[PDB]
Amino acid sequence: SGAIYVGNYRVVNRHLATHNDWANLVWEDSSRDLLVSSTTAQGCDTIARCDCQTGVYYCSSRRKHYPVSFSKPSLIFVEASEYYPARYQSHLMLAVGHSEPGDCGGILRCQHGVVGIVSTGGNGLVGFADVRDLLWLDEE
């Protein structure tokens, strides 16, 4: 589990979104595994605006933050899980790292701020949903 709290937005994995998220919906994209909902309180996270390929992510199944190198956001064939059939997931970045389903939502961050959230993995591979192209997270 986990979210990004930026401005009056809450950024979650679409497959973990609650009823309250869907009732306060701003934007959702199944192909990216992303959903954004509105919040009453302002959040403290800042979004990175960059092409970093190094950063640190939170792994809940180890209670540890790991430094990683990660690929640029891409269209990547992701094998079927409990939440999605085998499909191309878009805006996905891959790194070598431990992940399990409940790690979803862990933040990846670089020197500039938040880069994305854990979305998928297995076999020592972790995939992150990028948010750095979502420039509207920084306004209104």
Ligand X SMILES: Cc1cc(C)c(Nc2ccn(C3COC3)n2)c(C)c1
8 A C-beta contact, residue 23 and residue 81: no
Per the structure block, which two tokens stand in for 60? 């809940």
Per the structure block, which two tokens stand in for 111? 């020197």
Exactly one of 113, 114, 121, 129 binds ligand X (CB under 6 A); that residue is: 121
The identity of residue 54, as a single letter, is: T
Integer Cα distance of 108 and 93 in angstroms: 10
User: Could you confirm whether 59 is annotated as catalytic?
Assistant: no
Select from 43, 68, 64 the least CA-distant residue to 55. Answer: 68
114 binds, among Zn ion, ligand X, none (CB under 5 to 8 A by kind): none
Q: Whole-number minimum distance, CB 135 to Zn ion, in Å? A: 15
> Backbone phi, then psi, for 41, in 5-degree steps?
-85, 150
Active-site hit among 33, 59, 91, 103? 33
Integer Cα distance of 20 and 28 in angstroms: 14
The distance from CA 83 to its chain's CA centroid, rounded to whole angstroms, is 15
Q: Is 110 annotated as a binding residue?
A: yes
4 binds, among Zn ion, ligand X, none (CB under 5 to 8 A by kind): none
Binding letters toward Zn ion, positions 67-86, x by CB under 5 A: --------------------
76 binds, among Zn ion, ligand X, none (CB under 5 to 8 A by kind): none
Contacts to Zn ion by CB under 5 A:
48, 50, 52, 110, 112
Annotated binding site: 50, 52, 110, 112
Task: Supply the residues annotated as catalytic.
Answer: 15, 33, 104
Annotated binding site for Zn(2+): 50, 52, 110, 112
